[PDB]
Write a protein that binds this ligand. Structure first.
Ligand SMILES: Cc1cc2nc3c(=O)[nH]c(=O)nc-3n(C[C@H](O)[C@H](O)[C@H](O)COP(=O)(O)O)c2cc1C
Ligand SMILES: Cc1cc2nc3c(=O)[nH]c(=O)nc-3n(C[C@H](O)[C@H](O)[C@H](O)COP(=O)(O)O)c2cc1C
Lengths: 299, 299
């Protein structure tokens, strides 16, 4: 049995990594992720300059997941570029750098600079991504960035949008992976005891993660798995156990990202997840991920 | 203490009703809803003619809710119109009729015929509602239907969409209530044991209800409560307890609809829900729903 994944000219020991934005903002966190049992890691989505993010409380853990409105607090692009160029131990595991410019020009200017470090060191872009705007953004980035990359997608909720999104992404051969999903946007948690919301920004509205999002994540993973047969899918959303991870892979996932559960448990979670996924595979008589990836049975 | 609700020229004993499509398709179901402790009921979303709906299995109960792709199985408009005109006991409680024509023309034709029964008997339309398609549908109904009505909305996931939808709805004075929300669309439930989806239509993709959708429902209730101050909001999504119902009302709900939980429990649930909501209000020292409706505290 092996959890090995091979993609983008890399070998990964297992499919697990942190979700962008979770436990990956500081040097300490990035080193902790590298030292963990994870197959890989992705750095906090960056802007050109540092951002303090939204006022606190801006994250709340919940029985069925989490809600947040972080507001992109990050050390700025130079910091994550420097980590990738100078500090990260690529001998330990591959590295993804998440990028989230507040405009198309910001993404373009960051990608111009990332190009050389991707060439020299092998860091892989995950670009945090309105369909017209989307095509134009991908065109602008592809123009200046001479490497494969992936896109982090928000969830969609109908086949019309699955089709439209997939059509655009399929126009761009450099987009070699699609990460499904980012948070279910602008949920509103109300605490019945305090009769109030639980986070401060945006009147309590924030992105939902965890158990809430698993079926939506599976839907998006599988929808894009089917519609973009030329690309890989990275799963993200609602993974707490090796069994959840099994479901991501069955739906089509190559890599499996862990957000909410990692936030609550810390990097030791990857040790648990790898052994649980192996336990699930042994019970089901699978030896490799290739054996069941995308093989979910329809009725 | 009182759960009484006064709206749309009607008095309701309590805010509870079934969600459209749940336990309201047959004569026996409609009678059972009328005989229940609920404050109102709404008939199954109808098409001009009977529809068999999608192949089975097309509904599955889940630990955190439900998934379905029913495919509008219903007895047809004549049937629900005749129930409203000839059979329903308006002395027991008010009646809503849900309409879901497969085109603009179907809605126009059904509304033209509904008009007289609404006039004579007092049945209230809930119209099951692409912002252009929405504008056109509403414009057509408003043009031909000489009464106030409400709209059943899908969930939105950002402020741009909340603003755009509210803008459209505010252009129509006849829309006097907004029901938030229909299912979270096209999730995909996978059973780890069978390595398969759990419903037959549409490769296993279907609408999510129940515990999965509560924060999204609260978000939408509150978003339209804020943006459509001229209108009533009916809450729908994730109500299993009086505490859940309390949250809907706090977010801004006037009526509270119950889908998944009712499907699982049957109409006896309304007796439990009324007593639970009264118990919540008693512990919190509330006497009426007016005392806390829409009063959720932000930070
Ligand atoms: C604390 C917090 C911060 C996040 N920051 C980012 C971000 O920087 N960029 C991004 O693409 N996603 C970010 N996400 C979304 C996650 O990457 C992930 O898509 C989401 O949490 C769903 O996964 P989960 O169910 O495992 O939590 C963040 C999520 C949370 C909980
Ligand atoms: C069995 C099934 C059938 C449904 N049929 C309809 C329908 O006829 N019209 C409609 O507007 N919503 C329909 N719905 C959506 C529900 O009215 C409701 O919006 C959704 O289930 C969320 O509420 P819940 O969490 O209480 O289940 C249906 C839901 C289910 C579970």
């Amino acid at each position: 049995m092996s959890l090995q994944v091979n993609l983008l000219n890399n070998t990964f020991a297992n499919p697990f990594m942190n979700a962008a934005g979770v436990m990956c903002t500081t040097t300490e966190e990035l080193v902790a992720m590298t030292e963990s049992a994870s197959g890989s890691l992705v750095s906090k989505s960056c802007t050109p300059a540092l951002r303090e993010g939204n006022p606190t409380p801006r994250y709340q853990a919940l029985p069925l997941g989490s809600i947040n409105s972080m507001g992109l607090p990050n050390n700025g692009f130079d910091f994550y570029l420097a980590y990738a160029a100078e500090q990260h131990d690529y001998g330990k595991k591959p590295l993804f750098l998440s990028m989230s410019g507040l405009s198309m020009r910001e993404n373009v200017e960051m990608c111009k600079r990332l190009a050389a470090v991707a060439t020299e060191k092998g860091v892989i872009l995950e670009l945090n991504l309105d369909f017209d705007a989307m095509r134009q953004c991908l065109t602008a980035v592809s123009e200046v960035y001479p490497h494969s990359f992936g896109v982090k997608m928000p969830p969609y909720f109908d086949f019309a949008h699955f089709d439209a999104a997939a059509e655009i992404l399929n126009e761009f051969p450099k987009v070699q992976f699609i990460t499904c999903i980012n948070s279910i946007g602008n949920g509103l948690v109300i605490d019945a005891e305090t009769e109030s919301v639980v986070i401060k920004p945006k009147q309590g509205f924030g992105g939902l993660g965890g158990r809430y999002v698993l079926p939506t994540a599976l839907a998006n993973i599988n929808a894009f798995y089917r519609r973009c047969p030329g690309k890989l899918i990275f799963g993200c959303g609602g993974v707490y156990t090796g069994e959840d991870a099994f479901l991501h892979v069955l739906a089509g996932a190559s890599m499996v990202q862990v957000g909410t559960a990692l936030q609550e448990e810390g990097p030791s979670i990857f040790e648990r997840l790898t052994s649980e996924l192996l336990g699930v595979m042994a019970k089901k008589r699978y030896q490799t991920l290739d054996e069941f990836r995308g093989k979910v049975r329809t009725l």
